[PDB]
Amino acid sequence: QARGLGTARLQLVEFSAFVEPPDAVDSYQRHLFVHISQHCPPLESVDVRQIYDKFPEKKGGLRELYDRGPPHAFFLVKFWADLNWSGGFYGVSSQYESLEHMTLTCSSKVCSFGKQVVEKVETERAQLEDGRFVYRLLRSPMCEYLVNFLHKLRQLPERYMMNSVLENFTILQVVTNRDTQELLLCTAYVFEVSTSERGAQHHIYRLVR
């Protein structure tokens, strides 16, 4: 059914992860590691069992989440990350959109070899705008674990080694209705590096079973 990253209950308007150099205050610029923009065909599909072992087990892992359902809320995003941009500002921004008013709880578990490593949980109630509610989680500071990992990754001598290391690094995003606990949107991210002649790129799949 789906054609973008979203459902009828909750659509992703924009997601990005970025850095602003210390110079940004005199002349502005930001460098986008990854960027989904859904302002203005069916998506490809990837069978969720094939990536079970890339996200935690027991509880809050991919197999029980999909088992809770609803199935249509699950997506996979391959990112090609741009790491060609010292002490600046590193941040993540997300905007979701619904027809109805809720409080959103957003967790993002970072995983390495399938073991949760860091997790951040942020909450966000709706702001009624043009006949629909919008949820704005803009400029969340990246946790120092990610920023350090970026600084280490950016230093390796070959792209293939960056991709090798990234083969074991994933991020899982679970958006739930805070009041009712129902799953609205669940999003697995897997990462390569882009040959930064090309900046960031992505490909969204639905996760089916």
Count CB atoms within 10 A of the CB of residue 194: 20
Cβ contact 209:9 at 8 Å? no
* CA-to-CA separations, 61 to 55, 112, 116, 120, 156, in angstroms, rounded: 6, 13, 9, 15, 30
Q: How was this structure determined?
A: X-ray
Q: Which helix (H) or strand (E) holds 165?
A: helix 159-166
Structure tokens at 73: 């809320």
Name the token pair of 209: 């079973």
Structure-token pair, residue 29: 């610029």
Report d(CA 55, CA 143) in Å as an integer.
19
Rounded CA separation 26/29 (Å): 10
Domain region containing 174: 4-209
Number of domains in the chain: 1
- CB burial string 96-128: b at 16+ within 10 A, e below: bbbeeebebbbebbbbeebebeeeeeeebebee
Buried b (16+ CB within 10 A) or exposed e, 142-169: bbeebbebbeebeeeeeeeebeebbeeb
Contacts (Cβ under 8 Å, ≥6 apart) of 12 = 4, 5, 6, 36, 38, 94, 95, 96, 185, 187
Rounded CA separation 10/200 (Å): 24
Query: How far are the Cα atoms of 100, 176, 181 from residue 185, in angstroms, in the given order?
Result: 15, 7, 12
* Cβ–Cβ under 8 Å, residues 36 and 12: yes
**Pair 193, 80: CB distance under 8 Å:** yes
Amino acid identity at 7: T
